[PDB]
Amino acid sequence: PDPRTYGALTKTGSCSYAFQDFARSNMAETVTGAKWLVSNGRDILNSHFEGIDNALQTLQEYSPLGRSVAVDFGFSIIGGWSADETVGVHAVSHETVIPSNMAGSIMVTDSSTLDGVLNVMVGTSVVGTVTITDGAAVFASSEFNLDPGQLVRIVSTSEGTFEYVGLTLVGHRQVVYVD
Amino acid sequence: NSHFEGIDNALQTLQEYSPLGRSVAVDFGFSIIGGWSADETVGVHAVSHETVIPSNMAGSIMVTDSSTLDGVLNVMVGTSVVGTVTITDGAAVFASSEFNLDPGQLVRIVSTSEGTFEYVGLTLVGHRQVVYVD
Amino acid sequence: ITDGAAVFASSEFNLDPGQLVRIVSTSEGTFEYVGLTLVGHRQVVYVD
Amino acid sequence: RSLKEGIGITVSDLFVATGNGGYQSISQWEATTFLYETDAEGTSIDGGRQ
Amino acid sequence: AIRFHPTNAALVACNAVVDLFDAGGSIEVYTGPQPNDPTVAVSTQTLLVTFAIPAPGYGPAELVPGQNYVRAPGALPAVAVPGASGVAAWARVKNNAGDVIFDGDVGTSASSAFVRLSTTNLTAGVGVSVTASEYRQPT
Amino acid sequence: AIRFHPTNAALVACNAVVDLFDAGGSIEVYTGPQPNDPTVAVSTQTLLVTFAIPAPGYGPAELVPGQNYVRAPGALPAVAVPGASGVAAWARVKNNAGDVIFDGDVGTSASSAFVRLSTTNLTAGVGVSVTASEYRQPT
């Protein structure tokens, strides 16, 4: 109690021991040998359940915060298109992000010989383009944010014939609760 | 009051269904107007992410105004047939087995025989894993 | 609709499985494309 | 009060006790009307004390 | 509400049907749609892959403690390469005598269907190994 | 889930059970409660009446056109005089040798229980006519 200092402690041997209210420094420490617990702990069972941070850390890495990929815009087309013809449009509801190169997006069709190019238009100016060759296609474009009210447009520059063509894009939206 | 853990743990297990290792339903729809013709490819969709369709297409639905339309619809993927739909006097049932869906796969619906009506609606359901990009 | 001026008017209502929503026009229209979209609230019950 | 929202799997039941004493069962001393299932195939009726 | 006695009946019922595979058999998996009933012969399905059941197909029978059924593991066939490409949907079984014994279903690896698959999507020229498949008779 | 071949499989399985009753059998009905399963031993319930299965009790198996199960016609035991009046709760079957085959439940005529009664409670010494005795086996 005076002059208010902590005495040293040290135990290196292997002899078993047991503490009970052995007040000492609350800082880190290190002891050797098989400790025994005698304190009961029902008032106010080994001491440190500080592992609870593990469980809480589990329920933080997973939580509804951050974007989700479940926003997809699917279009189905039958018969064919003409040169400079619109085949699909959609009204954006909630602000959305577009991945670079339109990654995640995919197109498939039966026409193994179809060869053409598509252009993505929002408002007035193009925003993305997809080339089509041998029934396959390649995406190539940058990113661009979409906001409520904005209208996404697609047109076929050149005429094309087929049975059916499917084009699906991908976006990222922030999860949000509502009432 | 010590031994809080004995009930704190109880409080913790409650919220122990956070969205990890779990799936939610995803809905695919169709729309057809003024009948169709036989052998008509009336709707396709390209999968964007891994999905699993429960057997018998449980949860799928059809609606119409004919109250009399008859025929059969084929749930079609590429050159394989996964399932079909029975229609009887405006009432329809689903029949198929479980199967997987993968990105790059394409769904297709083909009419078997000619149909007459004003409008028909169709919608399927599938299971998708919950994922994050951040 | 009045020169692109869209005004919505309706009251709160429910939707149940087994029901189909129907959209019916009134008079002829001229345009290149028309975009319409509705917002609905769904619960997040998991499907196992 | 034990309100069982919905008609779910678990019925409502009650108990009481002090820190050390035993438990008591309210359900054991109430006049309970019942809805015994007919058991006809497929004719399930899930219900009970709400 | 019939409840078979484990020893008296359950084993007999399992052995009566399972023992007929002692001559071996085959397993055929065809694209959908599944036939209405085993009596109906294949009319528009396409063969995807086939297996064979080394003798004995099944037996001896054994009880399953803490359950309502008796299980009896059988043979462990080898790998087969698909005879086509597509999505597996339906399966059929034939004994050494070629008799269509029964019809089941297939599904994902977590499914309760007859045959569990890593993925129904199958392409010709890629085989898989038969992990296991057994029988259960509810009591 | 599995669908069996009726002729090849179903009849075989159906016959491979009821044939045990070729040399007759015995039935026992008790008041409640009902034991968990046949392996359990009668300990506290009260026997009501003893029914003797005619030899043979059932078989051979037959198909059921326009149906999803097979049928096995059964024998007709003679009316038995009950002992003390008791409320039927559950039934049990013992073969000619006495071995328990399966458990059974009780219920009214319209009830899906295999034991159909004209009235729920039977008075002592009142002989009750035998409704019918047919066993079914799903296809």
Automatic annotation (TrEMBL), chain C:
It comes from the Viruses. The lineage of its organism: Viruses, Duplodnaviria, Heunggongvirae, Uroviricota, Caudoviricetes. This is Putative tail fiber. The chain holds residues 540 to 587 of 587 of the full protein. It is found in: Virion.
From TrEMBL, chain D:
The chain holds residues 200 to 249 of 298 of the full protein. It comes from the Viruses. This is Structural protein.
Automatic annotation (TrEMBL), chains E, F:
This is Structural protein. It comes from the Viruses. The lineage of its organism: Viruses, Duplodnaviria, Heunggongvirae, Uroviricota, Caudoviricetes.
